[PDB]
Design an enzyme around this catalytic site. Structure first.
Site, PDB file in Angstrom:
ATOM      1  N   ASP A 121       0.814  -1.155   0.003  1.00 28.61           N
ATOM      2  CA  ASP A 121       0.159   0.004   0.068  1.00 28.61           C
ATOM      3  C   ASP A 121       0.716   1.371  -0.290  1.00 28.61           C
ATOM      4  O   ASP A 121       0.969   2.029   1.093  1.00 28.61           O
ATOM      5  CB  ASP A 121      -0.912  -0.090   1.267  1.00 28.61           C
ATOM      6  CG  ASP A 121      -1.941   1.247   1.378  1.00 28.61           C
ATOM      7  OD1 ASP A 121      -2.101   1.767   0.230  1.00 28.61           O
ATOM      8  OD2 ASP A 121      -2.708   1.236   2.420  1.00 28.61           O
ATOM      9  N   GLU A 158      -2.519   9.889  -1.392  1.00 26.27           N
ATOM     10  CA  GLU A 158      -3.808   9.234  -1.460  1.00 26.27           C
ATOM     11  C   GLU A 158      -4.164   8.941  -0.151  1.00 26.27           C
ATOM     12  O   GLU A 158      -5.535   8.781   0.164  1.00 26.27           O
ATOM     13  CB  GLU A 158      -3.545   7.801  -1.989  1.00 26.27           C
ATOM     14  CG  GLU A 158      -4.798   6.775  -2.332  1.00 26.27           C
ATOM     15  CD  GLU A 158      -5.046   5.741  -1.144  1.00 26.27           C
ATOM     16  OE1 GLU A 158      -4.353   5.880  -0.013  1.00 26.27           O
ATOM     17  OE2 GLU A 158      -5.815   4.921  -1.563  1.00 26.27           O
ATOM     18  N   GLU A 159      -3.493   8.907   0.870  1.00 26.51           N
ATOM     19  CA  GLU A 159      -3.758   8.469   2.260  1.00 26.51           C
ATOM     20  C   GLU A 159      -4.404   9.768   3.053  1.00 26.51           C
ATOM     21  O   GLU A 159      -3.741  10.699   2.892  1.00 26.51           O
ATOM     22  CB  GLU A 159      -2.700   7.648   2.838  1.00 26.51           C
ATOM     23  CG  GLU A 159      -2.421   6.516   2.350  1.00 26.51           C
ATOM     24  CD  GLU A 159      -2.997   5.339   2.702  1.00 26.51           C
ATOM     25  OE1 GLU A 159      -4.253   5.362   3.103  1.00 26.51           O
ATOM     26  OE2 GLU A 159      -2.395   4.350   2.409  1.00 26.51           O
ATOM     27  N   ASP A 196      -3.464  -1.162  -6.393  1.00 23.72           N
ATOM     28  CA  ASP A 196      -3.598  -0.767  -4.999  1.00 23.72           C
ATOM     29  C   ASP A 196      -3.528  -2.220  -4.176  1.00 23.72           C
ATOM     30  O   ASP A 196      -4.228  -3.136  -4.651  1.00 23.72           O
ATOM     31  CB  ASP A 196      -4.785  -0.070  -4.520  1.00 23.72           C
ATOM     32  CG  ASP A 196      -4.183   0.656  -3.437  1.00 23.72           C
ATOM     33  OD1 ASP A 196      -3.287   0.562  -2.840  1.00 23.72           O
ATOM     34  OD2 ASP A 196      -5.112   1.708  -2.899  1.00 23.72           O
ATOM     35  N   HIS A 273      -3.291  -1.318   6.541  1.00 28.30           N
ATOM     36  CA  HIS A 273      -3.015  -0.022   7.748  1.00 28.30           C
ATOM     37  C   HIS A 273      -2.628  -0.774   9.120  1.00 28.30           C
ATOM     38  O   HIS A 273      -2.911   0.002  10.096  1.00 28.30           O
ATOM     39  CB  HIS A 273      -4.312   0.567   7.629  1.00 28.30           C
ATOM     40  CG  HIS A 273      -4.667   1.250   6.501  1.00 28.30           C
ATOM     41  ND1 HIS A 273      -5.679   2.153   6.239  1.00 28.30           N
ATOM     42  CD2 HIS A 273      -4.033   1.484   5.194  1.00 28.30           C
ATOM     43  CE1 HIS A 273      -5.768   2.810   5.312  1.00 28.30           C
ATOM     44  NE2 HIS A 273      -4.521   2.322   4.508  1.00 28.30           N
TER      45      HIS A 273
END
Ligand SMILES: COc1ccc(NC(=S)NCCCn2ccnc2)cc1OC
Ligand SMILES: [Cl-]
Ligand SMILES: [Zn+2]
Length: 303
Positions: A121, A158-159, A196, A273
């Site tokens: 990621d 993106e995050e 992704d 995550h």
């Protein structure tokens, strides 16, 4: 949720046997591993590491004779405040009329006190794209001059910085889709392929969008054909997934009717995550196989 893909969308691999064999035997395991290693560092927007990773991407592709634009802009994020974001736009032909776009995000999620590497990621997805240009150098040369060409797009921001929402995520994609909208530079995207959460074991893919379901089935057919030829060291299901509304860098393009092919597994990796999305989670048989399938899809589409 899941519906079987209708035969109308089947779209078998078209490359001639000699060309499919030739191309499927092109690889660079060491380079793929080296690219992963260079990107697999904490790389929050605005950090020295963030800049180093951008530079590596940029120089890697420039050295392969790609044209590379860096789309720099400022935008306010929660916690961090004013941040300087940098999208990376690499093209083989910068004066092409149309593009297949392969993309991934290069930032890593800000996780205080935790040096989150975001291996799946999206360290591994970015690496697959650098590796694709490196492996296929010779076969992609024609696309420097042709009307249909290839773009590798590396999204920044993106995050989320605080909590994932419409105003605290996909900072770079939101800015770029808006910019291209205004400049009339979205219609030129045949489709935006977004990689992704790749690199972990037993990924399951599904087609998310009916206007690209046919090209999804081309990847599915690439995988089948490779299995039959003993070239893999299955991932793509012949099923589509509706009302999944997975949010990612494609959204602002999808909203504006850019066709999306979203190469993201469902379920997401178990380590998603968490600190365990690191060097040790990477399954290199799976990573090599996926990279290959994606490289062949690219060649199938582009010739
Ligand atoms: C636990 O697995 C899931 C968690 C969340 C969602 N829903 C959304 S809207 N996700 C947005 C993904 C943003 N992103 C992608 C990569 N890094 C950040 C779906 C999931 O499984 C289908
Ligand atoms: Cl740093
Ligand atoms: Zn993430």
């Amino acid at each position: 949720e899941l519906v079987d893909i209708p035969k109308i969308s089947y779209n078998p691999s078209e490359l001639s046997e000699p060309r499919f064999l030739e191309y499927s035997n092109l690889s660079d395991k060491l380079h793929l591993r080296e690219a992963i290693d260079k990107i697999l560092i904490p790389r929050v927007v605005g950090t020295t590491n963030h800049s180093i990773v951008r530079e590596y991407i940029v120089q890697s592709l420039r050295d392969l004779d790609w044209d590379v634009e860096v789309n720099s802009f400022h935008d306010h994020a929660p916690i961090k405040g004013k941040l300087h974001f940098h999208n990376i736009i690499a093209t083989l032909n910068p004066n092409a009329e149309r593009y297949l776009v392969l993309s991934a995000h290069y930032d890593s999620k800000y996780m205080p006190g935790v040096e989150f590497l975001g291996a799946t990621d999206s360290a591994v997805p970015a690496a697959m794209l650098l590796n694709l240009a490196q492996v296929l150098q010779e076969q992609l040369k024609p696309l420097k001059k042709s009307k249909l060409s290839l773009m590798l797009l590396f999204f920044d921001g993106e995050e989320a910085f605080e909590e994932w929402g419409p105003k605290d995520s996909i900072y770079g994609a939101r800015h770029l889709a808006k910019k291209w909208h205004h400049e009339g530079k979205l219609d030129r995207i045949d489709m935006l392929v977004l990689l992704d959460l790749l690199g972990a074991p037993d990924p399951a893919f599904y087609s998310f969008f009916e206007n690209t379901e046919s090209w999804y089935m081309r990847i599915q057919s690439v995988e089948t054909r490779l299995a039959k030829l003993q070239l893999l060291e299955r991932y793509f299901q012949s099923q589509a997934m509706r009302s999944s509304f997975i949010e990612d860098d494609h959204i602002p393009f999808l909203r504006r009717n850019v066709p999306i092919l979203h190469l993201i597994p469902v379920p997401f990796p178990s380590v998603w995550h968490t600190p365990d999305d690191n060097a040790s989670v990477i399954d290199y048989a799976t990573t090599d196989n996926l990279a290959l399938i994606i490289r062949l899809f690219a060649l199938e589409y582009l010739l």
